[PDB]
């Protein structure tokens, strides 16, 4: 199957498969069962920010999620992406709902990747920044219920005419061009991703979350990967 590496912003606690007893941030490596997690004070209704960093020197994947003027949550895990992911991958955002729902709105997204081989200043770089999403975003691959153009935002999961979120929905958005994430002869390789989101929920508890992920190029939404699976995993192993 696909090869996933993701940083999830889990809004619902499915303790029946690993989730801590509260909304959390986590690092997933080929499994929905996070290798490491951190408590997160989700704030239904307002805009938050997520910063994700990784470099080949420390080989440590770290994430920060915060809300303006509130406290921020941090999670880190040591991992050598070199022997987890293929040298060429695709990056994207995923989200889903199920029994409970929430909106999974992306207001902006930027990505930067740099690879310098042992030849020195021989640096290869890729950078894209989205602050506005048009109705026809040809540089994005939309899967599932994902749509763009509404208010200039990217809505990952189904949203009604008035803006009410819907249950049992999944959708992703991957950047069109393949990304060279690591090279055999690379002195330094690093990348950083950032995106602002807006999770609003009408019912009791919002669910199920958003996640930044890296995968094999031809990756696609697994069947039934709605709900607790965040549109990333076929099962919960």
């Amino acid at each position: 199957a696909d090869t996933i590496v993701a940083v999830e912003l889990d809004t619902y606690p499915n303790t029946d498969i690993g989730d801590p007893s509260y909304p959390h941030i986590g690092i997933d490596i080929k499994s929905v069962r996070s290798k490491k997690t951190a408590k997160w004070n989700m704030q239904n209704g307002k805009v938050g920010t997520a910063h994700i960093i990784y470099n080949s020197v420390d080989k440590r994947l770290s994430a920060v999620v915060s809300y303006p003027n509130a406290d921020s949550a941090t999670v880190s895990y040591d991992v050598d992406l070199d022997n987890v992911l293929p040298e060429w991958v695709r990056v994207g955002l995923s989200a889903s709902t199920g029994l409970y729902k929430e909106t999974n709105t992306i207001l902006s997204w930027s990505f930067t990747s740099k690879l310098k081989s042992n030849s020195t200043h021989e640096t290869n770089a890729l950078h894209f920044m989205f602050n506005q999403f048009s109705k026809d975003q040809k540089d994005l691959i939309l899967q599932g219920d994902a749509t763009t153009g509404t208010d200039g935002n990217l809505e990952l999961t189904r949203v009604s005419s008035n803006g009410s979120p819907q249950g049992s929905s999944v959708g992703r958005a991957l950047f069109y061009a393949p990304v060279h994430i690591w090279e055999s002869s690379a002195v330094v390789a690093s990348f950083e991703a950032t995106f602002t989101f807006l999770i609003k929920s009408p019912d009791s508890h919002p669910a199920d979350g958003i996640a930044f992920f890296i995968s094999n190029i031809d990756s696609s939404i697994p069947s039934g990967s709605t709900g607790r699976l965040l549109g990333l995993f076929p099962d919960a192993n």
Partner: peptide, 15 residues
């Protein structure tokens, strides 16, 4: 008043 649900933690501010 509007809200942050079943929220979690400590000292924070973005109403």
């Amino acid at each position: 008043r509007v809200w942050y649900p079943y929220g979690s933690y400590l000292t924070a501010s973005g109403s």
